[PDB]
Ligand binder design. Structure first.
Ligand SMILES: *[C@@H]1O[C@H](CO)[C@@H](O[C@@H]2O[C@H](CO)[C@@H](O[C@@H]3O[C@H](CO[C@H]4O[C@H](CO)[C@@H](O)[C@H](O)[C@@H]4O)[C@@H](O)[C@H](O[C@H]4O[C@H](CO)[C@@H](O)[C@H](O)[C@@H]4O)[C@@H]3O)[C@H](O)[C@H]2NC(C)=O)[C@H](O)[C@H]1NC(C)=O
Ligand SMILES: *[C@@H]1O[C@H](CO)[C@@H](O[C@@H]2O[C@H](CO)[C@@H](O[C@@H]3O[C@H](CO)[C@@H](O)[C@H](O[C@H]4O[C@H](CO)[C@@H](O)[C@H](O)[C@@H]4O)[C@@H]3O)[C@H](O)[C@H]2NC(C)=O)[C@H](O)[C@H]1NC(C)=O
Ligand SMILES: *[C@@H]1O[C@H](CO[C@@H]2O[C@@H](C)[C@@H](O)[C@@H](O)[C@@H]2O)[C@@H](O[C@@H]2O[C@H](CO)[C@@H](O[C@@H]3O[C@H](CO)[C@@H](O)[C@H](O)[C@@H]3O)[C@H](O)[C@H]2NC(C)=O)[C@H](O)[C@H]1NC(C)=O
Ligand SMILES: *[C@@H]1O[C@H](CO)[C@@H](O[C@@H]2O[C@H](CO)[C@@H](O[C@@H]3O[C@H](CO)[C@@H](O)[C@H](O)[C@@H]3O)[C@H](O)[C@H]2NC(C)=O)[C@H](O)[C@H]1NC(C)=O
Ligand SMILES: *[C@@H]1O[C@H](CO[C@@H]2O[C@@H](C)[C@@H](O)[C@@H](O)[C@@H]2O)[C@@H](O[C@@H]2O[C@H](CO)[C@@H](O)[C@H](O)[C@H]2NC(C)=O)[C@H](O)[C@H]1NC(C)=O
Ligand SMILES: *[C@@H]1O[C@H](CO)[C@@H](O[C@@H]2O[C@H](CO)[C@@H](O)[C@H](O)[C@H]2NC(C)=O)[C@H](O)[C@H]1NC(C)=O
Ligand SMILES: *[C@@H]1O[C@H](CO)[C@@H](O[C@@H]2O[C@H](CO)[C@@H](O)[C@H](O)[C@H]2NC(C)=O)[C@H](O)[C@H]1NC(C)=O
Ligand SMILES: *[C@@H]1O[C@H](CO)[C@@H](O)[C@H](O)[C@H]1NC(C)=O
Ligand SMILES: *[C@@H]1O[C@H](CO)[C@@H](O)[C@H](O)[C@H]1NC(C)=O
Ligand SMILES: *[C@@H]1O[C@H](CO)[C@@H](O)[C@H](O)[C@H]1NC(C)=O
Ligand SMILES: [Cl-]
Lengths: 301, 270, 157
């Protein structure tokens, strides 16, 4: 109330599971007028056969949806919806059920959770919520002892013992026959993946002595993360300078897993313009930045 | 309305104006009509008026003899970022939670309609969960059914570091200096957060097995953030001489994990 | 002034784990996807996060792109989200930009990300449920703790 339309073009589903297809631009508001909605299926090279709304058949076409009670291996194909000033398509691919198991390998949704950080499994379904009889949680296809309501949940601080496949099954009855919707999560616990706020080593302002004609090698070191970037700013906006060269950065990993990056700015044939101008070096992270300025002062000062 | 405050070795307290319409909302601080009481003892007790509608408040203070349990809750609480945490009422921790004796919670003045238990259980803690938490519960006697007020201050903290500190300044293992002139080398070091923090930042001078300790001047915390802490301590040479070249100046820095040093060898500009 | 540094292939997801993707309608949407579905729905699900230099550093300057047929870059022009038909620029001759965002970790939650617009400060990239779909929109920070402005970036590193 409302429900997400299947916007994604390619859909993978497992055989024997009640599945549905909901078109977009679906508004069931009381102001909305009724209109002719058409669903068609394609098989192989070309078919474009209109979907059959037969007397309580496996396929159920109503309101905005194309229900399947359930999907089977032969349902794989290209589906299409047509409306007044609206056309949608999908590439349905129905994969084989792992019979010597409780959940199929391919229909897994992996999540990585950090140790001692909030871990949760909420066994929910909203579309088939009215038809659901009982719901259960499984860890590596072994049932879990809980209060086991209309939604059994896990809520704890993650421990390496929580690593495993969590099958979430929803049993429902459809005009006599029992079906189930199973959604497995591939949870893998991993050690403190905490990042450091980067920092440039040395003072914030450097006056680097040198006389005209000669060359300088401004070195900017940084204590940063693996994914962090270190760069130099020397007026690329005013155009390109053929005397300022930004050498390829160097990276090392300290025994305690600390990253140090060094990038040098080569300033060839120092001229009067290269003097009393701030050559900034900065660290950039998802968790912070730090900037350093290097002023070139005459050796005579 | 009569509220009671059971003091100890170290606590805090607040008294906010309660009225039908939120129209607006001494040495002890005052902010947003909510008058706060810091370090009182047995003094801060009695009637307090706020304003026709008049909000009457008859405060009472008494010291706590001893804790009713082993795991008696603190008035300063720490919530780890990104994990599951709890804000337990100190005034109602030792009774555990057989049945919630009508607990009302207030986070920075605003009421918390959902939370009515002895504990606020925060599923996933974020920085905004930080603040002044006030747990209020009514306890009856002979005629007066006075309310009990306890104030817990909670902070959102990141788990203690697993890394030793970092010497930001100096970096270079050498230094160009002119003799017969003063010199003050600065040592800047960054320390990853620790719950119990006992950092070390000191300079020392060594010449092979010979070692000299510098004690003056005092260290200084220049920056303190959420993840880290930067401390700075200088070494002063009133006149650098030829001898200061025979030795090395080493800055020492250490936290609960380990130590890191940066020794600077002095060289003359000549 | 912004200077294109480097790129990374990433899959952006919301906190209810819904994968961000560009549909046939060429609009950026969120949807529940199994690892298989996410893989099979590439390149729509795989985004090109490009990092930039900044003349006035104020957090990780970044562009968000997708190579469906050709590369398309995310714009927040006129406070409205759109995918402009263009490759990430090599240079941006301005302090603020409708295509540049500051990718920033949330305090204590180092793997949760927030993208503030460089052009409209106070406004962030967010997931808002509009009718029958989850749109990637640009909204001003209204209340503390808004989880719709937080995201997870799974790299191919
Ligand atoms: C959700 O709904 C689906 C259907 O839509 C259910 O799927 C069926 O589940 C079973 C078990 O997962 C499938 O597997 C079948 O297992 C048989 C053996 O199991 C028994 O014997 C072993 C012995 O070691 C025991 O350990 C075990 O507990 C069982 O007692 C196999 O024999 C089947 O293989 C083939 O042979 C038989 C004849 O013997 C044929 O009739 C079969 O068709 C098949 O060719 C098979 O592997 C079964 O296939 C599933 N049915 C369908 C139609 O898909 C899910 O169980 C349900 N979810 C839950 C939680 O209940
Ligand atoms: C809060 O808790 C603290 C403990 O953490 C508690 O302190 C203790 O108080 C008692 C008194 O209430 C002290 O014990 C007495 O000490 C005096 C000397 O100072 C002795 O003369 C007493 O001896 C008589 O009683 C004994 C026991 O019945 C007999 O065995 C003996 O023969 C004597 O007749 C007695 O030992 C105790 O030393 C302190 N301890 C500490 C560590 O403070 C405090 O009193 C509690 N608060 C309240 C209000 O009760
Ligand atoms: C190199 O860096 C300088 C300095 O940049 C500043 O300092 C760093 C250590 C970091 O903290 C940076 O984040 C920070 O920007 C650049 O020049 C400086 O730019 C700032 C921002 O534009 C200027 O501030 C403004 O100044 C005006 C006028 O006084 C005020 O009205 C504003 O309120 C604001 O404070 C600052 O004046 C300016 N300083 C200098 C020394 O010019 C510099 O542009 C940059 N150079 C290059 C080549 O990138
Ligand atoms: C459940 O999630 C885990 C990851 O959390 C998946 O495990 C990963 O699976 C691959 C399988 O090949 C592992 O091996 C890798 O293979 C490549 C082959 O090219 C090789 O180059 C690598 O060096 C590596 O050996 C990978 O290590 C493994 N990782 C972990 C942490 O287990 C698993 O596949 C997921 N399950 C499902 C059903 O999707
Ligand atoms: C869950 O289902 C049971 C059983 O339902 C029956 O079997 C299904 C496969 C399908 O054919 C249904 O139409 C059947 O009713 C429910 O148990 C029944 O409950 C009614 C009273 O509500 C009782 O009269 C029946 O005798 C029960 N059936 C049996 C087999 O004992 C049960 O109520 C359902 N629970 C929930 C929470 O949905
Ligand atoms: C830039 O400065 C850094 C830091 O001083 C230099 O890098 C390290 O130097 C130490 C010297 O004790 C070596 O032990 C490390 O192996 C170096 N690490 C790296 C990552 O290079 C760096 O060499 C300097 N570069 C220039 C050209 O001056
Ligand atoms: C600083 O850290 C070093 C290790 O990096 C400590 O040195 C160790 O000291 C113990 C004795 O306490 C010896 O058994 C080890 O062999 C030493 N290790 C090395 C590699 O020398 C040192 O004690 C620490 N200093 C302080 C003040 O804590
Ligand atoms: C598809 O498979 C189901 C399996 O129950 C079967 O009933 C149906 O007839 C099949 N359809 C076709 C077209 O073969
Ligand atoms: C058709 O639908 C689109 C939205 O999908 C709308 O912009 C357009 O105006 C509609 N055209 C007509 C003729 O109704
Ligand atoms: C109140 O009493 C305390 C001792 O319990 C004392 O330290 C404080 O100064 C007193 N305050 C006033 C205002 O007299
Ligand atoms: Cl650190």
């Amino acid at each position: 109330g409302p429900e997400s339309c299947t916007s994604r073009p390619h859909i993978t589903v497992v055989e024997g599971e009640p599945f549905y297809l909901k078109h977009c631009s679906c508004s069931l508001a009381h102001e909305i007028e009724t209109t002719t909605k058409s669903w068609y299926k394609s098989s192989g090279s070309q078919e474009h056969v209109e979907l059959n709304p037969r007397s309580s058949s496996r396929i159920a076409l109503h309101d905005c949806v194309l229900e399947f009670w359930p999907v089977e291996l032969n349902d794989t194909g290209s589906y299409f919806f047509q409306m007044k000033n609206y056309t949608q398509k999908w590439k349905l691919n129905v994969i084989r059920r792992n019979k010597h198991s409780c959940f199929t390998e391919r229909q897994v949704t992996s999540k990585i959770v950090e140790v001692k950080k909030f871990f949760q499994i909420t066994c929910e379904n909203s579309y088939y919520q009215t038809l659901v009889n009982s719901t259960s949680l499984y860890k590596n296809c072994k049932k879990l002892l809980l209060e086991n309501n209309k939604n059994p949940t896990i809520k704890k601080n993650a421990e390496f013992e929580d690593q495993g496949y969590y099958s979430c099954v929803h049993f429902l009855h459809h005009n006599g026959k029992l079906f189930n919707i199973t959604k497995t999560f591939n949870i893998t616990i991993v050690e403190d993946r905490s990042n450091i706020v980067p920092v440039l080593l040395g003072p914030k302002l450097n006056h680097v002595a040198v006389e005209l004609g000669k060359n300088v090698r401004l070195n900017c070191s940084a204590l940063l993360n693996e994914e962090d970037v270190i760069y130099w700013m020397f007026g690329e906006e005013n155009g390109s300078d053929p005397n300022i060269h930004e050498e390829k950065e160097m990276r090392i990993m300290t025994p305690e897993g600390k990253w140090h990056a060094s990038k040098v700015l080569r300033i060839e044939n120092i001229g009067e313009s290269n003097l009393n101008v701030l050559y900034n070096c900065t660290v950039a992270s998802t968790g912070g930045t730090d900037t350093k300025s290097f002023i070139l002062v005459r050796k005579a000062d | 309305l009569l509220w009671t405050y059971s003091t100890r070795s170290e606590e805090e307290f607040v008294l906010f104006c309660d009225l039908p319409e939120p129209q607006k909302s001494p040495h002890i601080i005052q902010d947003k009509c909510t008058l706060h009481f810091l370090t009182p003892g047995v003094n801060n007790s009695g009637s307090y008026i706020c304003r026709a509608c008049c909000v009457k408040m008859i405060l009472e203070v008494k010291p706590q003899t001893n804790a009713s349990c082993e795991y008696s809750a603190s008035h300063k609480q720490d919530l780890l970022l990104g994990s599951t945490g709890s804000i337990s009422c100190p005034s109602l921790s030792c009774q555990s939670d057989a049945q919630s004796p009508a607990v009302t919670w207030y986070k920075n003045g605003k009421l918390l309609s959902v939370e009515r238990s002895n504990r606020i259980v925060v599923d996933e803690v974020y920085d905004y969960h930080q603040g002044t938490y006030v747990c209020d519960y009514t306890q009856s006697d002979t005629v007066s059914s006075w309310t009990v007020r306890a104030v817990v201050q909670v902070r959102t903290i990141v788990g203690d570091t697993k890394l030793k500190p970092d010497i930001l300044d100096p970096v270079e293992d050498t230094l160009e200096v002119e003799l017969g002139k003063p010199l003050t080398i600065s040592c800047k070091a960054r320390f990853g957060f620790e719950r119990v923090f006992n950092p070390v930042i000191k300079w020392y001078i060594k010449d092979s097995d010979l070692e000299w300790e510098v004690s003056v001047p005092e260290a200084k915390s220049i920056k303190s953030t959420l993840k880290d802490e930067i401390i700075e301590r200088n070494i002063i040479l009133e006149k650098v001489t030829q001898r200061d070249l025979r030795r090395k100046f080493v800055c020492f820095v250490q936290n609960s994990i380990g130590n890191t040093t940066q020794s600077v060898q002095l060289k003359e500009k000549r | 002034y912004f200077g294109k540094l480097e790129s990374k292939l990433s899959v952006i997801r919301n906190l209810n784990d819904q994968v961000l993707f560009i549909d046939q309608g060429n609009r950026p949407l969120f949807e529940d996807m199994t690892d298989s579905d996410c893989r099979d729905n590439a390149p729509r699900t795989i985004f090109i996060i490009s990092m930039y230099k900044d003349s006035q550093p104020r957090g990780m300057a970044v562009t968000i792109s997708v190579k469906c047929e050709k590369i398309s870059t995310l714009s927040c022009e006129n406070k409205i989200i759109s995918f402009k038909e263009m490759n990430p620029p090599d240079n941006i001759k301005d302090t603020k930009s409708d295509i540049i965002f500051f990718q920033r970790s949330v305090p204590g939650h180092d793997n949760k990300m927030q993208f503030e617009s460089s052009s409209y400060e106070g406004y962030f990239l967010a997931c808002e449920k509009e009718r029958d779909l989850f749109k990637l929109i640009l909204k001003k920070e209204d209340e503390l703790g808004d989880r719709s402005i937080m995201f997870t970036v799974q790299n191919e590193d």
